[PDB]
Design a binder for this molecule. Structure first.
Ligand SMILES: C/C=C/C(=O)SCCNC(=O)CCNC(=O)[C@@H](O)C(C)(C)COP(=O)(O)OP(=O)(O)OC[C@H]1O[C@@H](n2cnc3c(N)ncnc32)[C@H](O)[C@@H]1OP(=O)(O)O
Ligand SMILES: C/C=C/C(=O)SCCNC(=O)CCNC(=O)[C@@H](O)C(C)(C)COP(=O)(O)OP(=O)(O)OC[C@H]1O[C@@H](n2cnc3c(N)ncnc32)[C@H](O)[C@@H]1OP(=O)(O)O
Ligand SMILES: C/C=C/C(=O)SCCNC(=O)CCNC(=O)[C@@H](O)C(C)(C)COP(=O)(O)OP(=O)(O)OC[C@H]1O[C@@H](n2cnc3c(N)ncnc32)[C@H](O)[C@@H]1OP(=O)(O)O
Ligand SMILES: [Cl-]
Ligand SMILES: [Cl-]
Ligand SMILES: [Cl-]
Lengths: 562, 558, 562
């Protein structure tokens, strides 16, 4: 039932059974993961109105609405801890990520109605753009579970104006619509002004019977007097159901309770165009042959230690199968085709450890795994270009310390080749996933399908072993202060300040808090995200290459045989 | 020598000669303007290495490089005071804006080498994106005068990572290239890592003979020892001319001094495709019939005072001519075609003052100028859609206090119609200029061709009479605290804080508006924008195939 | 003054000095060329009104207007002999091709006012579409020297209706405009209805003082009476200058005579955006090191004879330099980068002669040059894909007898690989030139950047040694009638009818008459056309790859060294 099994089935298998577990390493990784989960929990529960109080007066929390909406176990939260401005509640007042609904993947945004009635808080605008961007790049339906009181008044200057403030998503919703990507909103509670526009910008509007959307809402001693004297009229909240259902017909449908709204959304989701993924499969979905739990021993928290990348790839992709492009050329990178629930993806991943007698442009040299050289860069360039032609999404597994430096490296074209890769990625036009296994550092972070490719990277996730910095604090301390040491003790103070500050500001939690990485995910959650991404990417792709017309597999084969 | 003079020449003229100057108003506006210029000056001069010291060792400052590059008097700086993170030096370490080069408009980005050798500072990445974005939307060549030491080490966490950090411009440069928009870099001084990529991402590389671009540069007591012992070798800065000219050939050309580099850039700029603007003209360029200085009396700093928008439009556009679309329908807005150096633009501007017997969906009502109603919204929708079809760039003059509120307004479809306008703008696909005359407030700021339309708004500028807020502090204080003595404290805290954080300078510092420009600089920017937009447009509507003028005429006669 | 001389300058040189001329071969080719020129001459001079009579009453012929418009010696006519419907005059009543105007290449269409006042004749619509298509694909300004009386009344059914009839160009002109490509028209003489629309559809209208454009023009015994009684009024031809200049302002400018109109057009052409080609050069323009006249000896008219393709490539491209991609892999094809007036092009060309010990999927086999095999097809696929990424236009030199047949070939994926190439070409999105050196046959004609790629092939030209057929008449005779032999003299009659008919209908002149190839060009005109194409393609390209970000040269180098 599949094309070209000779190419796409029974690929080389990779990975060993884990013979030597590392409980202490596992304990270190799980400690990071636990801290993320506790922080996510503490953040979701924060706010003046609890889930309990919400339920008492007939409303569901953001997570209850999501869990009601999605197929159980398909929640891939993104930006859970995103809090670039340090809001007290620890979030941006939206919950967002990928969920599956009766088999259809959709991007989900839910207003956190526990916190200031879903108000726009600092950082929210940016958070929201990352949502509509992901949807845009994947051509994936965007679902708003809206309960939004608009601009948080004290912070208006940070949430109301500017190119990428609270007004932007409404343009982004129109762009999704114009690109042919539907937006569905469940309207809950009071949605004035900023909330109103969030209500009116989507394609389909499903309202709670008590909900409203409006250009403006109901919002010294006389001021208190006027309030009760203007409340005794029982004048209705502007733009309630009798207005936007009965008069304007802007609300297409109206339900009695939150779960009704969710059902309405489900119905409209069921209307949306989506391939049966079977159409794009080259194999029946198969689990990896090696357990993901091993990743807790395989990927070392001791950043000085290498590890075999193949052991990671064997645990993330179907059947631990892998079809490497140009094995032996560019030994610092692994580039090859794999399968995620039967679907083709291109994988690009750093190789760790020492590389004897390499790179070829240096005499008597040893290459450092995690670094990028001429062959690695050209190989990736070719591979990205091949995958682009073939409409094969790229998954980048980053663990990098940069492109090789020095005039020998410069003469090898390395700067040009790294940028050539950037060019290749931008030319690819396909949605891409970036997974930071450990190190995201140097310009290599950018060129390795980094999140700086705003047209291609849908989002990025990291494991608990991950860290982000320009370069290690010690290298940066030398780079920053060495010459000032020769100009002239307060300067060595500054150097230790720097080494410390680089450690502090490169910890997984901080990184995702600032959004350098969208989500820290458990080692056992990496594949689930890959699966969510790949299936979302193949749901309604905007371009097709028939398998028998794909070049990547052919060029791969030829490099093997010729 | 022009198509359809019956439509495009001798349009109705508008505006009166200013009979009653307002010296006190003028003084208030000019005070704001003076404070901007002084702040811009103080910011450009800040940094450890002065223009003087730069010149002594053979280098030009960012502004010297720009002024050498551009036709004199064509500098339209943007983001002069942009400093969202409050860097001490007051800037993002880049100077940027529109300049003209031998008649060709180009977007210019110059590294401020006065400050940490042009290092990436907090806010810079965002600043840079606004540059490549402007270029992208206008299909305008982007010029880098590069002197960039890469990531500022202490602030690496704010300048190195993330979707829109320092790595983003390199993708943006590839996108410009792939969209067919050339990037030209003059490479100066040391450009390692972050600087290297800024050097290598553009289309054309012109290098100073002492310059370098590299993946990585040269960058307890032993550390100082190793330095002098590693400096005695006189080992060359990685990726210098002998490497990137003589070996890789990545530097296409190499010059002896800064002005040589500038000449190289000029030569390559001269290679770039550009219409003679005469091609798109419907008239010979004419100054307005009324002086711009009048704007200092016309546009009131007293925000409670109205003014006649037509008096502004008469002073910004060629010959004070204006061809209004649907005059009398949607009286709260003026929408119509005008001319900027002979080129057609669509103008959309708020009308101020009371509007007797309006809106039509209310009994015995008076409409507030600066607000948006059913007819205004539909009219703008139609006008934007018409101009889009006709490939006519839109210039929005904002002075707004929002769309009308209340259930009567809701039944009039107002929410839907504001969003419909957002849809129309996004559908338009053309580059657009937004000018905040005074008030940028409410969702109206967004729908009136706001900078939130990231695919259409190239950038936005404001006059000294401008201010940005969700709503006035007093209205916000009621909205925030009404339902709730420490509470009246908070309300005055809010009214004050809204005043503080809505002043022109603050607004542009945060980048809510890209530049505060002098009243006499508004037209120059309009001229820069329009001419840049018509230089190499990606789409054409022949004048005789334009709908806007036809539909306009028909509304007048039928 | 150029990027990366190490890659782009001092490429390997190719080709030998011609030691053994072949005068008889030369004579055979030049005979074909002479017949083309005579036919083109006879066609241009045909019509009831001569150039002499035109000049007497103040008008220029199409060729006079073109020659006036263009830089001398830059005329590249296309479709000179295009006459699919066999019109008596031998043409489609338009003259078209590429001309250069003060350094700017433009596509030119001129109404043949010698023939029924520039009326729409059968085949014209198609001819016109090829013009707007070329302009569209190259993003090249389109110039109309219009003198058009609209639909030829007796042939209205063939020139007026249908998806690709006389109304289509007006839509095509709007599409060019919407794509950002300007159309300039010089309006001459009477242009009613069909002519009117041709006048009004362009961007810029320059009128002759006596010209008109109109929805409708002035057009038993009483009918003759009404004519003189309706002519005595001296009622002006509808839509003359007083109307379309003085009233509507549709004519932007008006000139006294034909050369004035041409000067108007020149002025507006001077307004058009165009790179100085220096911007895209990687070298200073250099002539080939070997003379093109040699082509008359090199390319054999005896179709059974091979020849060295390198000798052709050495004579068509700058300095006889060539940078071959994957030399030794896919030995049946040459694919590599070359220079045309300093500008990078990708060249793909058939290798002729026997290929010992090939293809690799057959035991004890000899490959036929001119045929396509696994490595050739994969190589081309890669090369096209590489050049697409790099924004390097492709020039295909076709001399082909098809992809290899048989189940061995089928197992080698040949069908899929040929179609993969079609996919690659369509993915390339760049303008492409196709030159038929000799044989355009089999599906190979299609996959080798054939004119069937309506989004990529701007047009196609052929030498006098060229010929087009599905397969040779003798092979086709067997294929058609062999089985009808076994089933059963009238059948061998039919076989000779076929062999003859295939010869007749595959001669260069017939081929271009039908438009299978757009123009038969002299051996010494091939490079000029390449030069016209390349410079037009680089004039205002819609996409750029910076040289230091180009992959083709890097991947080429690596295949050479690794
Ligand atoms: C261009 C766009 C501009 C804008 O968006 S302008 C902002 C317009 N927004 C409003 O008018 C909202 C006024 N709010 C209500 O009516 C809000 O009670 C509401 C009607 C929702 C919600 O009222 P509830 O009775 O349902 O109370 P909740 O538990 O859901 O939350 C209310 C609580 O959250 C906080 N809250 C709610 N909205 C905001 C905001 N916006 N900012 C800061 N804090 C907020 C505040 O502590 C509120 O207390 P009160 O003021 O006493 O009601
Ligand atoms: C992904 C990309 C990552 C990156 O970009 S990593 C950053 C790589 N950058 C470097 O290695 C630059 C090291 N700098 C030099 O060699 C720099 O002297 C330099 C070679 C330029 C410039 O040296 P000059 O001798 O020309 O001195 P300048 O007046 O131009 O400015 C130097 C001065 O500016 C400041 N400066 C310069 N660069 C930086 C930076 N980057 N951060 C903070 N502050 C800086 C600093 O006070 C410097 O003093 P010293 O350290 O004593 O030289
Ligand atoms: C959807 C679009 C539909 C259409 O285009 S409908 C066609 C509308 N066309 C007309 O009405 C053209 C009528 N022609 C004139 O007025 C034409 O004399 C004319 C005004 C040009 C040209 O008249 P001239 O006096 O300049 O004579 P010319 O030497 O340029 O050529 C005229 C000659 O060409 C021939 N001719 C010209 N036009 C046509 C056409 N169209 N078909 C066939 N043959 C034609 C014919 O033999 C003509 O002889 P007359 O009929 O005695 O004038
Ligand atoms: Cl790097
Ligand atoms: Cl509003
Ligand atoms: Cl074939």
């Amino acid at each position: 039932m599949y094309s070209m099994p000779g190419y796409f089935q029974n690929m080389p298998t990779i990975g060993k059974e884990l013979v030597n577990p590392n409980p202490e390493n596992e304990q270190e990784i799980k400690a990071v993961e636990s801290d993320i989960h506790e922080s996510i929990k503490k953040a979701l529960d924060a706010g003046i109105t609890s889930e309990e109080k919400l339920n008492e007066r007939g409303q569901l929390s953001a997570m209850q609405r999501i869990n009601a909406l999605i197929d159980p176990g398909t929640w891939c939260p993104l930006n859970s801890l995103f809090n670039p401005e340090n809001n007290k509640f620890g979030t941006t007042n939206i919950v967002n990520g990928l969920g599956r609904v009766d088999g259809k993947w959709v991007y989900i945004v839910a207003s956190d109605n526990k916190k200031m009635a879903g108000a726009w808080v600092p950082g929210q605008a940016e958070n929201l753009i990352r949502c509509s961007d992901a949807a845009k790049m994947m051509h994936l339906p965007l679902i708003y579970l809206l309960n939004c009181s608009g601009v948080e008044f004290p912070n208006q200057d940070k949430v109301y104006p500017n190119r990428r403030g609270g007004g932007t998503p409404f343009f982004r919703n129109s762009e999704l619509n114009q690109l042919g990507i539907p937006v569905i909103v469940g309207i809950y509670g009071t949605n004035p002004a900023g909330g109103g526009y969030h209500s009116i910008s989507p394609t389909i509007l499903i309202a709670h019977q008590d909900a409203n959307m409006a250009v403006g809402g109901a919002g010294a001693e006389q001021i208190i007097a006027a309030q009760i004297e203007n409340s005794k009229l029982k004048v209705p909240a502007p733009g309630s159901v009798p207005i936007h259902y009965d008069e304007t017909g802007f609300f297409r449908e109206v339900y009695q309770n939150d779960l009704g709204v969710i059902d309405g959304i489900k119905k409209y989701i069921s209307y949306l165009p989506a391939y049966n993924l079977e159409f794009f499969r080259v194999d029946t979905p198969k689990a990896p042959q090696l357990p993901a739990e091993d990743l807790y021993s395989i990927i070392p928290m001791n950043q000085k230690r290498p590890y075999d990348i193949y052991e990671v790839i064997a645990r993330l992709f179907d059947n631990s199968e892998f079809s490497e492009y140009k094995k032996g050329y560019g030994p610092e990178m692994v580039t090859g085709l794999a399968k995620v629930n039967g679907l083709l993806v291109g994988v690009i991943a750093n190789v760790q450890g020492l590389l004897m007698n390499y790179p070829e442009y240096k005499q008597n040299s040893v290459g450092i795994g995690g670094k990028l050289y001429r062959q690695g860069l050209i190989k990736m360039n070719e591979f990205v270009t091949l995958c682009a032609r073939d409409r094969i999404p790229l998954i980048w597994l980053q663990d990098t310390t940069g492109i090789d430096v020095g005039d020998e490296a410069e003469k090898a074209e390395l700067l040009g080749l790294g940028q050539s890769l950037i060019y290749s990625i931008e030319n690819s036009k396909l949605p891409s996933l970036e997974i930071t296994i450990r190190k995201a550092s140097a310009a290599a972070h950018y060129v390795l399908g980094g999140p700086q490719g705003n047209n291609t990277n849908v989002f990025s996730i990291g494991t608990g072993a991950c860290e982000y910095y320009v370069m290690p604090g010690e290298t940066a301390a030398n780079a920053m202060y060495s010459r000032k040491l020769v100009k002239a003790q307060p300067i060595i103070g500054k150097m230790n300040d720097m080494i410390q500050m680089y450690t502090d500001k490169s910890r997984p939690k901080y990184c995702t808090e600032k959004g350098m990485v969208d989500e820290i995910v458990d080692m056992t959650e990496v594949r689930p995200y890959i699966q969510a991404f790949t299936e979302a990417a193949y749901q309604n792709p905007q371009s097709i290459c028939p398998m028998h017309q794909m070049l990547t597999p052919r060029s791969t084969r030829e490099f093997e045989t010729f």
